[PDB]
Amino acid sequence: MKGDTKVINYLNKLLGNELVAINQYFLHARMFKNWGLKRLNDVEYHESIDEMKHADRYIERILFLEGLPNLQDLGKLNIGEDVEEMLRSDLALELDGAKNLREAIGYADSVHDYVSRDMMIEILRDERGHIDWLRTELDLIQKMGLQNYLQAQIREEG
């Protein structure tokens, strides 16, 4: 059974944001790791994996609705040059994606595709966990300054 075409188009757009997030978070994670920031690697690596899981959900749903998942067109990665920039870029990506997601949810609701709607709602809740974490780290960077924040990362992980 062919799904709603605009629903599939939304799912592909959202998948597109996840593909950027997977790569951006994975590269940021390994950058953190290479800098010896073990906590940040662990957090960022698991964020990347969670985005992979999201992408998989999108791919499965699109195929079920007889659409064609687009894994070809990779959007712009915004790789930061220091830890503050990297986290700010992650936050910007999450917020952009979240707005897209809320609009998509509304649309799926409007055409009674409740299964797609609810899948996207679960995903939204996940992204909001990451947004909450990011805002906390960034607040601490603001308060401490990046260099003291980084010293504390290393010292507190031990």
Residues that bind Zn ion (CB under 5 A): 18, 51, 54
Q: What is the Cα–Cα distance from 21 to 82, expressed in whole angstroms?
A: 18
Given the structure tokens 């994975």, which residue do they identify? 26
Among 6, 13, 33, 38, binds a copy of itself (CB under 8 A): 33
Residue 143 DSSP symbol: H
Given the structure tokens 């978070």, which residue do they identify? 25
Residue 137 neighbours by CB under 8 Å, 6+ apart:
87
Distance of closest approach, residue 69 Cβ to a copy of itself, in angstroms? 6
Binding site per annotation, positions for Fe cation: 18, 46, 50-51, 54, 94, 127, 130
Residue 13 or 33: the one with the smaller Cβ distance to a copy of itself is 33
The two structure tokens encoding residue 39: 């906590």
- Contact set with ligand HEM (CB under 6 A): 19, 22-23, 26, 49, 52-53, 55-56, 59, 71
Q: How many CA atoms lie within 13 A of 26 on its CB side?
A: 11
74 binds, among a copy of itself, Zn ion, ligand HEM, none (CB under 5 to 8 A by kind): a copy of itself
Residues 50-89 that bind a copy of itself (CB under 8 A): 56, 59-60, 63-64, 69, 71-72, 74, 76-77
Residue 66 DSSP symbol: T
